Each structure stands twice: as C-alpha cells, then as structure tokens.
Design a protein around this ligand. Structure first.
Ligand SMILES: *[PH-](=O)([O-])[O-]
Length: 492
C-alpha cells in the first residue's frame, strides 16, 4: 500500500469506534496541505517561528498564523466554525477573526458563525457583544452563536479542541489557544503548532463540531453545563455544518488523512455499535490514589467514545524506523488524573525493544502551567520499567532504552532559557513517524478526558517539510538538555 500507516490506524479505529465513523473520526482522500506558492511548507503554522534567536525578534511563524486565519475567514461564503479552550480569543487573534469576517461581509456574503469554548466550573454574552461592536455594519451579515461548555465537573471534561473551519472546505487545527498573553505580547512566547488544510478532511472537522454543538444545544438550558448567547433572534445551530455545507467537501489535492477526535466524558457513555474487547495492561504506579476511576487505562467504554487515544497508540505502533514526539508533557498531575497512559508507554517500549528509535521532547520542568513533571527521569524510569516486562529485566531494559531513545526538554536557541530569563514553554501535540505520517492536533499524550481533535496525515513530502521546518531545528537546540541520546551514547 502507498499508505501503510493510515491503513493500520484505520483498522484500529473501525474496531474501537465503528459507530462514530463519519462524525468523530473519518478517513478521507483528496486533501491538500494549504501552503503558499513561495514557501510550500507554510501549511505548518508553527509559532513563534524564531529559531536561533533568544530575543525572538523575527516571528515569521506568528505572522503567518495570524495572516492565515484572516485569509481563511475572509474567503468564507457560508460558514465559520471555531472551537477553542477558554478564555475566548483576544488580542491579535480576535483582531484576525474580526478582520476576516469584515472582509467576507464586504465581498457580499451572509454567514453563519459558531464559536465554542470549553471552560472550568456573563462571559459568552460579553464576547458576543464585543465581537458585534467590533464588526460594525458587517454584523448585519452574520448569524452568531457563542457558547462556553463543561461536560463533566467530576471528570474535568470540557472542550479542548482548537479548530477553525470555513465553508467545510478549509481547516486549521492544532495546539494553539487564542491567548495573547502566552503566545503574542511577551518576550517568552509559547512554542506550539497548528496545520492548515483543505479538502474533504475539513468536512470531517465540521461534522465533529456538529457533534459537539448537538450536545451543547441540547443542554443549553442547564446552567451547570452550558452558557449560550446568540445574535438577535437567532436560535442554537446544532447542525450548521450538515445543514449548510456539502456532505462531501470538494477535493483539492491528493493527500490522505484520518480525522480523529474524542467526546471526553459526559456527552456519550459508550459507542453501542462497538464490540471492542481490549487486553488492558497492568498498572502499578500510574494511579497515585486508590479511589480514582481511571478512564485512560481502565475503562473500555471510554475508549469507544475517545478514538483519538487509540489512534495515537496505533500511530506509534505503525512505525518501522523512527518516531518523534513533541509535547508539553507525557505525564499528567495525579490526582485527579492517572500519571501516564500505560498502553502508550508499552507501545513505545515495544518499539524500542525492536530497535525503532524514539525521540521525546517535552517542556522544561522549570515551567512548573506548562509542565507537569519535576524531572525527565519521570519519563525515562517509566519507559525502563515497561521495557523490563519485555526484555527480561532492568539491566536489559536500560540497555534497550539507552540504545534507542532521545529524551530532552525544549529549547529554540543556544540559550538554556529565553533572553528575558523565562524558560521556554512548549505546547505542541505532535507525533511524526518514518518521515511519512504525522499527527497535529489538540490531543495531548498525557492522561486527559477532554473533547479533542486532530489530523493524521500520510505524506512523505509534508513530513520532510515538518522535519526541516520544525523537528530538525528543535533537536538542534534541544539536544543539549538530553538525559538519554543514543546518537551520542548519552545515558544518564
Ligand atoms: P491544552 O490547551 O490544555 O493542552
């Protein structure tokens, strides 16, 4: 097959979540990574994109990101569909949205617009008011829905997807929250990444958002769950995508993609169609406390409504040569979450035991919002212990790990911190295998029970661009913090 990695992932998803095919995950063909003529790699919306410079003077990444947001929205003829994590977009992110909506209104278009945020237990109506003011006459051309939602207080579940879909044709998604203080107006900007695509896979994102809004509209009169605000006399639009855009979006290229998300906890308890029967591993030191219910490692039904967890573990399992992972963290803060995904660490171990190389780069613990560990030893110890189960003991586990792992914290310049003294924070949710197939999205690899979304893209050309523009510069500067690095025999 031309697509061995997606074939494997697709087969797993159809066993895990068959009833959610089309809506929460979907394989499509005919897509395009949406870069410019001049710089074809700039579908890769990294921020800040100021490699080598501890002062971050020339933020080519940030400029392109904000410009691409405006360009895509300004091309809307029917719908704009945005999700993110609260707070609502501010600063130049909000400016970009407003600018795009004004551009589309002046080209003559009448638009339906939804903006959904996930929130912890006045904000939505205030945001609607601010946007309506900033739009001026353009607001006459726009039917707006704005909502903040929480699906489970007890499971800490709410939207965390970060999606911008226009006309079901174009989609931007990834790890970037629309937060001016963390990303923009700061001399220690967070390092993150979104991708831009067009084609049928943008339709998949539209159907995911209909899934979320269908729940949101149903629960709009439950004030523990949902705060909703609309323009004028407009009702809630649970199915704007299905009602307004073509069931299959037009084709734009030749790129195969798997869209995959999850429903967290509190929208749907199980996929009734699923006959998935997982062999669940044995835990030990993930569930720091006894009373906690562990959806990541010990809840089959949870898997069936959260195909993305399985998808990421299958993507790892598909690698023949090498895997690069760039995350904020691999481990979560316990309680209330378990420390780590046992199956993920087992899949990485299985790979290293077979001589497939694994790179993990995470955020500097000196950040501990943007870190949940004290030391990289909390990742290497865990990997070693899981390797021990399949190499016959601790010595043979350490050897396999030191021969096949690169483990480090992130830097983007020769300096150990930003010039302003603040550590580098990284927030990517990125996995690439084989210079071939990659995930960019909102789903962290650390235990999390949220609604998330991303794309798995199989395109060697695109993956090489990802190497050149992000992973290679990343390892160039980050490798100086490595505790394990097989390529230089480092083994601490
Ligand atoms: P996310 O915005 O919590 O990773």
């Amino acid at each position: 097959s031309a697509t061995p990695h997606l074939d494997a992932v697709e087969q797993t998803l159809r066993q895990v979540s068959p009833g959610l095919e089309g809506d929460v995950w979907e394989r499509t063909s005919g897509n395009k990574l949406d870069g410019s003529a001049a710089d074809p790699s700039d579908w890769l919306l990294q921020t800040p994109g100021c490699w080598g410079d501890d002062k971050c003077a020339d933020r080519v990444g940030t400029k392109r990101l904000l410009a691409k947001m405006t360009e895509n929205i300004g091309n809307a003829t029917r719908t704009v569909d945005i999700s993110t994590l609260a707070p609502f977009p501010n600063g130049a992110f909000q400016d970009a949205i407003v600018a795009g909506l004004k551009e589309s209104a002046a080209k003559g278009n009448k638009l339906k617009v939804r903006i959904l945020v996930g929130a912890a237990p006045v904000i939505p109506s205030k945001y609607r008011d601010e946007l309506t003011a900033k739009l001026g006459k353009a607001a006459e051309n726009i039917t707006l829905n704005v909502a903040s939602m929480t699906t489970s207080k007890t499971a800490f579940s709410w939207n965390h997807s970060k999606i911008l879909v226009v006309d079901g044709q174009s989609a931007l998604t990834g790890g970037i929250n629309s937060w001016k203080d963390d990303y923009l107006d700061t001399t220690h900007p967070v390092s993150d990444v979104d991708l831009a695509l067009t084609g049928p896979a943008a339709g998949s994102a539209g159907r995911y958002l209909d899934t979320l809004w269908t729940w949101t509209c149903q629960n709009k009169s439950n004030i523990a769950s949902v705060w909703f605000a609309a323009s004028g006399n407009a009702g809630c639009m649970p199915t704007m995508h299905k009602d307004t855009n073509p069931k299959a979006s037009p084709a734009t290229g030749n790129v195969p993609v798997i869209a995959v998300g999850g429903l967290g906890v509190g929208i749907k308890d199980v996929d009734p169609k699923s006959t998935f029967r997982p062999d669940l591993p044995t835990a030990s030191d993930t569930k720091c406390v006894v009373g906690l219910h562990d959806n990541t490692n010990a809840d089959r039904d949870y898997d069936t409504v959260n195909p993305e967890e399985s998808a990421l573990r299958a993507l790892v399992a598909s690698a023949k040569g090498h895997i690069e992972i760039s995350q904020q963290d691999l481990n979560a803060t316990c309680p209330p979450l378990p420390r780590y995904d046992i199956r993920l660490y087992d899949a990485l171990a299985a790979k290293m035991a077979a001589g497939v190389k694994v790179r993990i780069v995470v955020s500097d613990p000196a950040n501990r919002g943007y870190s949940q560990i004290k030391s990289l030893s909390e990742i290497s110890d865990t990997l070693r212990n899981r390797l021990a189960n399949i190499t016959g003991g601790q010595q043979a586990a350490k050897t396999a790990m030191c021969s096949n792992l690169q483990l480090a914290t992130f830097r983007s310049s020769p300096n150990g911190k930003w010039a302003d003294g603040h550590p580098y924070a990284q927030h990517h949710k990125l996995v690439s295998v084989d210079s071939s197939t990659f995930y960019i999205g909102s789903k962290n690899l650390y235990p999390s029970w949220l609604q998330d979304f991303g794309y798995i893209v199989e395109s060697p050309e695109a993956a090489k661009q990802l190497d050149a523009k992000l992973l290679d510069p990343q390892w160039k500067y980050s490798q100086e913090t490595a505790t394990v690095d097989y390529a230089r025999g480092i083994c601490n």
